[PDB]
Symmetry: C3
Subunit: 314 residues, 3 copies
C-alpha cells in the first residue's frame, strides 16, 4: 500500500517527557525498512520540527494549549499534503493530542472519512470536563461537530473546524472512561466496543460490526488512531497512561489485519510510545516491537503469511 511517513516528536499534550522520542525509537527499530521489505511504497516526510513556545500559560485548567494547538496545526498541514500526494499518512507520535491535527488534515482532503479509535480511553474530555487539563485526553472533543458550542476558544486552536460527527467514529478497547466522557458517549450516541463488549462478542464480531457500522451505507476512507495503551501493558508498558485488562497482542494484530484487508485505510496514528517510561530496556523494546508489529499489519503483513504474484515452485 502506499505510505507517507510523518514524525511528530511532541509531548506537551501530557506531562511526561519522553513521548517525543517515539518517532526516533520507531525508526531505529527499522520501521521504514520493514515496510519496504513488504509490499510497500514508502516516502518519509521527515520529523516535523515543533519550535518552542515558551510563553504558554494554562488556559483555565488546560495545559500547554498554544503548544498543543500549533503542533496539531502544523501536523494537519503536513497530513493534507501526503494525502494530496496519494499516500496513506503514517503519523509516528508523540502524544495523542496530535490526533486533532492528524484527523483535521486528513479530512481536509477526505471529509467523508470514518475513524477507528483504538485506546483504553475515549479522549473526549472537553476543556470544561477535563480534570487534569492534559490535552492528550481531549482530542476527540475538538473534532466532533456535535460538541461545537461546548468547546471554549482555547489559544492555539482557532484554526480548528470540527470535521467528524458522532456517527462517524468507533472506539475499541475502552476501560478507563471519565463520567463526563461517558455522558458524552451515551448522549451523542457514539458507537463503542469497550473491553466488556470485546469480552462478550470476541474481537472477530467486534471488527465485523465496526466495519459494517462505518462502511455499510457505503465505502469510505478510514482513519485509524491507535493509542498503544489500548493494548495491555504486558505488551506496551512504556506508555504514559497504562490500564490493565487491555487488548491482547493478537487482538491488536487482528484489528489492524482486518483494517488492512478493507483496502480503505487512508490515515494512521501510532501514538503514546514513551521509551523513557519502560522500567527496563526490555520494556522499551517490548513496546516498540509491538508498535512496529501493529504498524506492519496495517499495511499488509499477515500472520497466515504473504507471497508475491510469482510461482514459487519456480
Amino acid at each position: 500500500r502506499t505510505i507517507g511517513i510523518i514524525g511528530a516528536p511532541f509531548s506537551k499534550g501530557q506531562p511526561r517527557g519522553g513521548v517525543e522520542e517515539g518517532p526516533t525509537v520507531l525508526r531505529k527499530a527499522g520501521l521504514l525498512e520493514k515496510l519496504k521489505e513488504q509490499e510497500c511504497d514508502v516516502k518519509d516526510y521527515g520529523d516535523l520540527p515543533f519550535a518552542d513556545i515558551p510563553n504558554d500559560s494554562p488556559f483555565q485548567i488546560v495545559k500547554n494549549p498554544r503548544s498543543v494547538g500549533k503542533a496539531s496545526e502544523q501536523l494537519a498541514g503536513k497530513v493534507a499534503e501526503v494525502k494530496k500526494n496519494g499516500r496513506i499518512s503514517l503519523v509516528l507520535g508523540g502524544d495523542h493530542s496530535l490526533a486533532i491535527g492528524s484527523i483535521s488534515g486528513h479530512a481536509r482532503v477526505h471529509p467523508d472519512l470514518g475513524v477507528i479509535w483504538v485506546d483504553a480511553h475515549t479522549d473526549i474530555n472537553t476543556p470544561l470536563t477535563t480534570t487534569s487539563g492534559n490535552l492528550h485526553g481531549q482530542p476527540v472533543s475538538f473534532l466532533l461537530k456535535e460538541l461545537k458550542g461546548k468547546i471554549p476558544d482555547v489559544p492555539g486552536f482557532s484554526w480548528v473546524t470540527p470535521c467528524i460527527s458522532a456517527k462517524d467514529i468507533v472506539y475499541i478497547g475502552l476501560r478507563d472512561v471519565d463520567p463526563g466522557e461517558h455522558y458524552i458517549l451515551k448522549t451523542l450516541g457514539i458507537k463503542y466496543f469497550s473491553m466488556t463488549e470485546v469480552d462478550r462478542l470476541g474481537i472477530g464480531k467486534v471488527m465485523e460490526e465496526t466495519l459494517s457500522y462505518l462502511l455499510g451505507r457505503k465505502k469510505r476512507p478510514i482513519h485509524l488512531s491507535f493509542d498503544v495503551d489500548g493494548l495491555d501493558p504486558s505488551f506496551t508498558p512504556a506508555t504514559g497512561t497504562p490500564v490493565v485488562g487491555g487488548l491482547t497482542y493478537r487482538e491488536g494484530l487482528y484489528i489492524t489485519e482486518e483494517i488492512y484487508k478493507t483496502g480503505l485505510l487512508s490515515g494512521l496514528d501510532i501514538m503514546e510510545v514513551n521509551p523513557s517510561l519502560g522500567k527496563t530496556p526490555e520494556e522499551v523494546t517490548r513496546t516498540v516491537n509491538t508498535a512496529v508489529a501493529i504498524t506492519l499489519a496495517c499495511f499488509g503483513l499477515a500472520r497466515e503469511g504473504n507471497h508475491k504474484p510469482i510461482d514459487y515452485l519456480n
Copy 2:
C-alpha cells in the same frame, strides 16, 4: 447498590496461615472508600471475632472441624442480619470454608437464592471423599440437599441444614476437580462451565447460559461465591491453591459486570486472598488489586464508564 460488609478473618478450613489477613489487606486497599466513591451505600458490620477453639482434634480425616463449624455458624448469623437490613452481604475472607455459613445465612432470609461459584475447584468433597481433610474443599457438600445422607455428623456443624439443591448452583472456572467430586457433579447433574467450556463458548455465552439457567424460570436472589484462585495466578498469585490456565482479569470483570447488571446480586463472597503467600510485595498488591476490581465490578463499576443522572455538558 446497598452493601453490608462483613470481615471474616478465618483460616482453619485449610493449612496455610495468612488467609485470615484478607479482610485487613482488602480494607487497606481502600475497598470501602472506593465503594462509596461509586453509587454505593455502605455499612461495615466489622470483622467477626473468631475466638480460639484450642481443643479441636480431627474428626476422622477432617481437620479443625469445630473451629470451621463455629466460624461458619457465626458468619451465617451475621449474614442473615445484614440481609434483614436490606443490604447485599459482602463477605471478605478468609478461606472458602466460610461459604457454608455465608450461603446458609443468606438463604435463611432468601431461601430461593441461586448460587454462582467462581473457582478453579468444585469444593464439593464430602468428609468421606476428601483426601486432604481441609474443609475449604468441602463447603458445597454441606449445603446440598441431595447429599443429605452422605454427610456424617461432624462436630461443630450440627446447626447446618442443607439450603440449596443441585439445580440451584452454577460453577465457572473449574480446572482441578477430584474424582469423587466429578462423580458427584455428573451424578447430581450440576450445571458447570469448566475452563473447557469457557474456551469453547466464550465467557459471553457462558454468562448468558449461566444467568438463563438460574433466572429463566423466574427472577431470584443471586449469591456469588468468588474464590480468587478461579482467576489465573498471573492475576491472583497470593492464594493457597493456585492452578494455571485460569480465568483472565477481563473474564473475571466480565462475570461480575454481568452479575451486577442483573440487579439481583444479594450476597457475595470474596475468598482465599492470602497475602502471606505472594513471593513478592508486588504479588500481594497484584492479588489484592485484582480482588478489589472484581468486587467493585459486582456493585456497578463498568469498564465502558459510569456517570450520574446529571447533565455533564452542564
Copy 3:
C-alpha cells in the same frame, strides 16, 4: 487409551543442540507415571539410539540430510511397530524433522490417516524454497503427494514415499510462514487456521471445523504433530524458534481435549522442547510442564475432572 512411547533424542534437523534432551526431561517429569495414573495402558519402546553419521555434508543448502533422513527412517520403522501392536504412538522429540518418519511409519499401518499440525510454522519449505536449510522446517514437503516432482533426491531420504495429500492435513497456530510456504498453502489449497482465524472464530469453532473437515466424509485415524512453539513462548519458552502471539495454555489444552474426545487419536508427536534454551531453570520447567499437560490431555485428562465407573458415594 493405549499408548506406545518412543523417545527420539535427535536435533540435527535444526542448529541448536539440546532438543535431543527432550525425551529425558519429559520422562524426568513423570510423564509415564502420570499417564498410568490416568486411564492409561503404557508401553515404553525406549529411546531410539541414533548412531552418528560423521560424513554428512550439506546437499545444496540442506543441512545434515543423511542424519535427518536415517533418524526419520529409524523412527518410521518403530512407529509402524507400535501401531501394529495396537497402540497410539507417542513420539517424544527431538526436532520436528522427525515428523517425516513419524507420519511415514504411522501411515504404513494406517494410510487413511488425517493430520493435525499445531505449530507457529507450516514446516512445508522444500529443499528448493528453504532459505536456512534446516530440515525441521521442511517435513511436510516430504510427506505431501502433490509436491512429488518438486522434491529433489536428497541423500538419506530415498526410502520416503509421500503418504498424505494436501486435503488430509490441517494447520493450527500459524504466525511465521515463509513466502514460498504461503504460495504452497494457497496453491495446494491446504486447510489452515492461522492465529488470525483463531482470533476471529475462537478455538471452539476452529476445532469444530478442523474435526468436521477431516472426519466429515468418514471416521479416520488422527495424527497430531505438536510443535510446542505453536503455544505462546510465555508458556513454552525453551524452544528453538519461538514466535510471540501464540496459542494460549488453555487453547492448547482445548485442542488436545477435543482431539482426545474423538476417540480417533492414533499418533502423536511432542516436538521441539529444548531445555538448553530456557534462560532460567524455571523457563525449562515451565516448558516441560506445559508439554506434559498437553500430552496428558491427548489421553483423557479433562479440566472438568475425571472419574472411574465406580460409585464414589461408595
